[PDB]
Design a protein around this ligand. Sequence first.
Ligand SMILES: CO[C@H]1C[C@H](OC)[C@H](c2cccs2)C[C@@H]1C(=O)O
Ligand SMILES: [Zn+2]
Ligand SMILES: [Zn+2]
Length: 565
Amino acid sequence: PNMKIIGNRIERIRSEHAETWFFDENHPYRTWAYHGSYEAPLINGVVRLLSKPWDVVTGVTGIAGQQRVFKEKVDTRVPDPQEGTRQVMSMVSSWLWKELGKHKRPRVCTKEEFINKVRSEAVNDPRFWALVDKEREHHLRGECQSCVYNMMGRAIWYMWLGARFLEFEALGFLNEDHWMGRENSGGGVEGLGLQRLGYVLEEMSRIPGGRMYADDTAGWDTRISRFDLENEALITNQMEKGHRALALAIIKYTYQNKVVKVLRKGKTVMDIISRQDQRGSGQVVTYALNTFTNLVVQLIRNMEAEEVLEMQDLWLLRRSEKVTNWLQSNGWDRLKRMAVSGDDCVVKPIDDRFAHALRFLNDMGKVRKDTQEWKPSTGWDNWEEVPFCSHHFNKLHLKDGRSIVVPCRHQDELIGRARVSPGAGWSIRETACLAKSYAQMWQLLYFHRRDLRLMANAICSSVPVDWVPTGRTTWSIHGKGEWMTTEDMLVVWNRVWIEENDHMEDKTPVTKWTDIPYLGKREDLWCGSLIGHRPRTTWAENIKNTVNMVRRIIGDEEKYMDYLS
Ligand SMILES: CO[C@H]1C[C@H](OC)[C@H](c2cccs2)C[C@@H]1C(=O)O
Ligand SMILES: [Zn+2]
Ligand SMILES: [Zn+2]
């Protein structure tokens, strides 16, 4: 650990718990530096009432310990990549940052920009912004007192709103100005909704070349190296001095010299640990930086596949001109052959040599999940089967014959998520408004699933028509929230799928839900439908009674609409 960079944060924590602070010689940390310890101090009823057949489906109820996740997934170390591999990573990262910045200029994001985003509160308190100003002052002198994570076990690293603001101030431009949008990056998909991603995969399927590859990197955030963090930091070279000072401090304390608080006769202690590599999951620009580095990784894999990089280049890259020529000649074409959303990627290489191009990938520590380290990847011939962003995408037809490309995933995950309510002491109003959000999201994106179109209509029939949807149905950047409204969902469906859909040539509106298709029965069943299963048949036959019961609970004096008739 670099005690000159992390010492101030450790001292501040120690000062706040001086009388319980202690050093535990039997701590379980192996790859994280350990500094000390101190003594530390759900269910959506509306959806559950309307989804009885899923009470006994473990794929649903399972959706609703920290030390265990830490020991197995976060407390690991990987060897450094070889010198040649590191030179290739830096060259490709430098080239990519220059391409992304050709038509965009970095900028500082404002307090008002952050305030407008949070209203979707400590922000309306002048004392919170005073804390923010004090920490900024330390950063401008080369010090950090409070940019510390609280690790909560997949591992999510939390940070106080003030540190997130300082990160947004210095690097939020990557998000706000869409540096990873498809127009700017070629291979990125930032800003596209799930309603558009299938069309991107279908466009890629038509580019001549090999199969479509969609390999996952096992524990992506844990495999981000100190070299990846240095290459991501090259964006500071495009910033003016003042902005650069703010960004260099975020990179130094939040990204590269991290300090984390983790919990461990029924008593609990908090441990203070540190690590220089890995991605601190949950940062304001975690998604943009993951997309950046995954684009760099896939460009390198394509160079190895195309024999631009040879096995002698792992040890030392003697001559760099071949890599520069490949990036200038082919880089943009290869970026357009990718769809990269953070750690998720689909690549359409120029041939199938990509399947066995694993030397640089493995030397970089970007090991594929569920495949033997040196077994060639298996590509897909059918774009409709390619996994991307936890979905697959299928082409269906409206009653009038027009095709549409819709997102799909196994239905248990969707119902399981809708049955979860984050927050205790929640009234039936907050609960019903979050249920309405899920149901309207299903009407917009998963209308082609028989069980979800019915369940959504039952939920919408059970919640007062004037109640505004609230809460978050997903954390995915591809969930644009068009369903968070009291506007008629058939009107919103038309806006999303017809009017604003550049892949729908004929703009004729759709005037009835019966013109909007379902998947074929076989596909609906493959993806988890309970159509034809007796408990589901009973639930559908009894659905009007179940809706009347929910309306009685919420209040028969409210105004309801029958979306089931
Ligand atoms: C990785 O998983 C998420 C991805 C996905 O978008 C790509 C989903 C969306 C739903 C609605 C709009 S986007 C949400 C989903 C989730 O919450 O698990
Ligand atoms: Zn700080
Ligand atoms: Zn499906």
